[PDB]
């Protein structure tokens, strides 16, 4: 599969100084012109917020000093003013190939220092290696039959995202293809719900876990983030921890 | 592996393609005033349109079958409105026009297609597309004009390549913006193709005066099936092609498919052309090459 790396693991950056964030793909991302490519910014404790779709296109409501670049397996963010507001880890992902990727996220720090969709999962908190857990995201205010992709997505410590599958609103769905005989994704929607099956968890799994909506244009963009559910995998029950 | 076989087939399958409609649309049905002709192109396009659906269909359950489609379906009812529309158009236009004449108007995708761009998506292109493009205006200009006016046919072949630059520029922006696959861009056209065409034919009554028809020459069913079949095995191997070797191999060798079709008609189905006229289509097919190559 595509491996996405970022150069820059932390930079140091001044307020109102032009940052650049590179972001190099092991394969050529390009299709019919187009570099599918998305760029996103997660602040500490938060479910990551969509910036690009594309390498250059801007999302809707993003401040206009991001700016995207970049073609072939090459690519950067660049952020002329930089302000207090977006000191974030950024992360980019292709779209080109089913397992879809991100990279592993880049870190600024100040130097000297109807439409409206609500994801909410849930789930065991502590489960024992080998056990069968599922997982359960609610949505509300939209109906998952209408339209969009709804995706599951994990970050494990260290904030490395992945991509696990996803279902899409005609019942198609697609999976991760390291990860394809251990879950399975399944909706109910009278409920208005869609869950995930891990079964036989090992000590491996242990991340936070986001339901994500998303549209595809120019690549899958998760635009839309649950605030994401921890599992903790022990052989041992935690306790006074 | 070499593999040459995708020039082979896709040069018999169109020639065959070809010829068999010069046999159909431009054929002597009956003999004196119970002489006939070939008006059934909606007919015709629809039987087209299924065969290849099928054949589309079949290819995708059988050969990459992991893909999405991420296309919306209603992209793909608007690109089938054009494509049926500059099918049925260049079918009919045979009706006036000698096929020779129909092939090369048709083979003048790039103008409109430039044209469309320049218009509607203000692109820029280099000098060399401008030069091209002057080569084929000036060789269809030698070929379809004499010093000794336009009729129906002429208008349809123009309406025709209008509704093919419409549907080119369709397929490139959501192939663009949603990867669409040739399969499912084949499969999804032709079954919206095949709808909108059964509805029209249906609510025109066109059906059952096709059938009188082809009652009285019942040869037609089978020259019409082999049109079909032919059709869509000239797209499957369009589509091995392009996989296994990109859109450009694929534009050259129809590019060489159109030239030859164009001599083999002249030469068995004894159609006039003056040496004049000559000139005019191998400056166009010229004109296609060098801009082929020259992006
Ligand atoms: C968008 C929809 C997609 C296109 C649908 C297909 C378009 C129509 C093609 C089929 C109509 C066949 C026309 C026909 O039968 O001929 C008539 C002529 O058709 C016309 O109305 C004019 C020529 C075709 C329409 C285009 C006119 C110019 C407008 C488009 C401008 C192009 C830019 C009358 O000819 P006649 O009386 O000598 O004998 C006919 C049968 N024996
Ligand atoms: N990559 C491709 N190149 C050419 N034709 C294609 C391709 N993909 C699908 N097709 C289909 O094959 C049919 C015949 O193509 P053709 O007109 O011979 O191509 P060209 O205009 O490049 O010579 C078209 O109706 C088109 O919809």
Redesign the pocket.
Known sequence: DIVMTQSPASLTVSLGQSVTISCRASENVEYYGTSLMQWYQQKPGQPPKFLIYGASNIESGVPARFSGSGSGTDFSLNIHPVEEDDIAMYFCQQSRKVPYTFGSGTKLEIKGSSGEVQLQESGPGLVKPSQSLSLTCSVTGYSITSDYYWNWIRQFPGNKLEWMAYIRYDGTSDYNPSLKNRISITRDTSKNQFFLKLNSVATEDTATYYCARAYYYDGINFDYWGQGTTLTVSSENLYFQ | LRLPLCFLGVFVCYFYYGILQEKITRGKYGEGAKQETF?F?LTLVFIQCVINAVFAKILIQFFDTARVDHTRSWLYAACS??Y??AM??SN?AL?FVNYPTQVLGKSCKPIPVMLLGVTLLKKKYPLAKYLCVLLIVAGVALFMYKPKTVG?GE??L??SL??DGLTGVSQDHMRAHYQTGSNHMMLNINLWSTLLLGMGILFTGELWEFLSFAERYPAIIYNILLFGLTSALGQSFIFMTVVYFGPLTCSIITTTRKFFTILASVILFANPISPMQWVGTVLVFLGLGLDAKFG
């Open positions: 008006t192109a409105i054009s049926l529309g049925v158009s009919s009706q129906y208008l349809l123009l309406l209008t509704l």
